[PDB]
Amino acid sequence: SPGTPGSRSRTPSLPTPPTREPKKVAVVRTPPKSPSSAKSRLQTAPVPM
């Protein structure tokens, strides 16, 4: 950069902290283990004549 004659100030400015990055983090992972069941029954008493 152009400027004043003789010695000029010696300045670094690279910011240390990480930028935006791929860590979305909040995703569904483990629902509780859950099976549905249709169920059935059939009445079975003595049935003579």
Place this chain on the structure above:
Amino acid sequence: MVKCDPRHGKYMACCLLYRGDVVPKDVNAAIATIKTKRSIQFVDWCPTGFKVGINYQPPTVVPGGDLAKVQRAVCMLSNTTAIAEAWARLDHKFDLMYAKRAFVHWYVGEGMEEGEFSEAREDMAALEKDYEEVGVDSVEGEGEEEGEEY
């Protein structure tokens, strides 16, 4: 002393036992009075329908009882279709438990057959019809309710 109506049944045989201060002519008159009150229908296939016994010792009531004391008393055993009609009830309560085979495992569990219950039902049903045949005494009739024209 059985929960059956004798007027609904038909008398078949009687044994009358008499105790105490008893007269044979008065026993005869008492039984003759029943036979003339023929609404107490006995079977027509057995007109000689009475047996009699007479003993001199009157009944004793055991202390702490409730029975009145008496100089004379009467005991009877009677055969009649009414008590088979009481059996026909006891068989139709067996039939209802067996029609759903209720309780039969407490008896098959002892090493009976279920076949025994079916045998027993049928033997009993044969007995009710044995009594129906003798309820059918083929007794003759009396009259009609109405008269005629000419």
